[PDB]
């Protein structure tokens, strides 16, 4: 009768424990919020699996627990509701009969068949005679009314048991997809080209491309145990923490099955932060060779072809404020296809404009505003010349480029 049920729950648990550390938790826990001003809590739907392997299903075989009377917790501001199921006795009688017991019994008799003695209890009560599972947290209003804590998440048997977590997970996948395509676009178009310079672009793309298919399948069918999702989420956080200086390795939360609020929300926001921080050096330094009053810079770099905005770093014996009024007028850039020591005709489409910022305290920075034909002639000829007259004084030039995307 009851003897067969117990062992077959143990058989299924022993099998679940081969692949999962915690095969127990909530699948569904729904409540009637309408009676909370009247200090009464009722469950509407409960699909909960107890740590001993016992699955409770209100929709199938089980009866909803009796109403939770909140009159007993008038002195409290927070109450943690748990679903309780009496512990099965190996030596004793697990059925409610006439005789009184010092402990609750697992079953009651109905119609005749066995029915579980499910009740709603609170975490501040003595519950060691019961198998317990968190099912909600009630917190009070400014008015002092009981209301279910929106931030609450119970131990999960399925990801689907937490719709909020589900939302943040879909959000994380969208953020990851966006950052992966952006990084796939900024990849060196050789024939595929990888070198010693961009370890960040490779290892960040290897991290994202390896994780994406794996996390997408875990989220397409979100009805498996969260231990699977955690492992793959933590694997990604770890891969991403290699290029982080603001976040330490200790930042990856350990798996606390009983308190998923301290594991999935911190891990998802850490991942979100790591994904926003995932921006390799988009600055290309162009070396400027000085041949008297001329400055020559080579534009051989493949990344400049894609689209980039140029800036000028200028240091001179000329005073700071007097340099911004003279440099855009005096300094005229040279034609890339042409070779000389002085530029008599400045290029069509080039306009040096002084800027606040793109470190050097005495340096004055200016934006190198270029047109469709001006940037074309420079990149096609793979060179850019600059003429700085003797009137500018002991002038030094450095060319910087910021790659678009």
């Amino acid at each position, epitope marked *: 009768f009851q003897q067969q049920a117990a062992w077959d729950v143990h058989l299924a648990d022993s099998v679940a424990r081969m692949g999962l550390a915690h095969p127990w938790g909530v699948v569904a826990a729904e409540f009637d919020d309408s009676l909370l001003p009247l200090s009464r809590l009722n469950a509407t739907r409960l699909i909960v699996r*107890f*740590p*001993d392997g016992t699955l409770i299903d209100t929709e199938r075989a089980d009866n909803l627990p009796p109403v939770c009377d909140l009159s007993t917790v008038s002195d409290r501001s927070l109450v943690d509701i748990v679903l309780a199921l009496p*512990l*099965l*006795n*190996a*030596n*004793g009688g697990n059925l409610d009969n006439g*005789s*009184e*017991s*010092e*402990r609750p019994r697992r079953w009651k008799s109905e119609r005749a068949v066995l029915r579980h003695n499910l009740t709603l209890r609170m975490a501040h009560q*003595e519950n*060691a*005679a019961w*198998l317990t599972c968190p099912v909600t947290r009630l917190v009070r209003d400014a008015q002092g009314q009981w209301c279910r804590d929106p931030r609450f998440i119970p131990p999960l048997l399925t990801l689907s048991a937490s719709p909020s977590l589900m939302t943040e997970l879909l959000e994380l996948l969208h953020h990851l997809q966006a950052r992966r395509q952006r990084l796939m676009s900024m990849r060196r178009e050789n024939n595929a080209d990888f070198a010693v310079a961009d370890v960040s672009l490779f290892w960040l793309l290897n991290a994202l491309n390896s994780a994406e298919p794996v996390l997408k399948e875990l989220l397409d069918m979100p009805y498996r145990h969260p231990e699977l999702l955690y492992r793959e989420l933590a694997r990604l956080a770890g891969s991403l923490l290699t290029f982080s200086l603001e976040h330490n390795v200790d930042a990856v939360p350990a798996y606390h099955h009983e308190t998923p609020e301290n594991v999935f929300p911190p891990l998802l926001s850490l991942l979100n932060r790591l994904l926003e921080a995932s921006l390799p050096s988009r600055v290309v330094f162009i070396e400027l060779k000085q041949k008297g009053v001329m400055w020559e810079g080579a534009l051989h770099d493949a990344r400049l072809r894609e689209g980039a905005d140029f800036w000028l770093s200028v240091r001179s014996s000329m005073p700071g404020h007097e340099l911004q009024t003279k440099f855009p007028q005096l300094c005229k850039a040279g034609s890339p296809d042409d070779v000389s020591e002085v530029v008599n005709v400045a290029l069509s489409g080039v306009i040096i404009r002084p800027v606040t910022h793109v470190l050097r305290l005495e340096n004055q920075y200016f934006a190198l505003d270029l047109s469709t034909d001006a940037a074309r002639a420079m990149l096609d000829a793979g060179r850019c010349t600059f003429y700085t007259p003797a009137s500018l004084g002991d002038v030094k030039l450095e060319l910087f480029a910021v790659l678009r995307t």
Partner: nanobody
Amino acid sequence: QVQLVESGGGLVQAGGTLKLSCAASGSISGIVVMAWYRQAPGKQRELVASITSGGTTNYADSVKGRFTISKDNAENTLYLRMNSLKPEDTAVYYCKAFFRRDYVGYDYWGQGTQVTVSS
């Protein structure tokens, strides 16, 4: 596993007193609740009083207001102070231990101690 030994039983006149003791040893950290049971001649074993590991007491209606269950955690001893004794309290008293070795419950018993209440 838990081991229990009762002592303190005997003969008393009606209105008298007895203090039963129950020495507990073993994996005491797993005890959820301790109780006192009693078996009268033709009658079956009935619950007398219980005490949870947190100290919550409960008594049968027949002994409520007369008996006191208490625990000495230091000496791992369960006590039953039986005051205002009545001849109807004559029975063999057993101490019980309800133990938990996750996630299953187990019952442990004492040998029994005879309590006779004369008039």
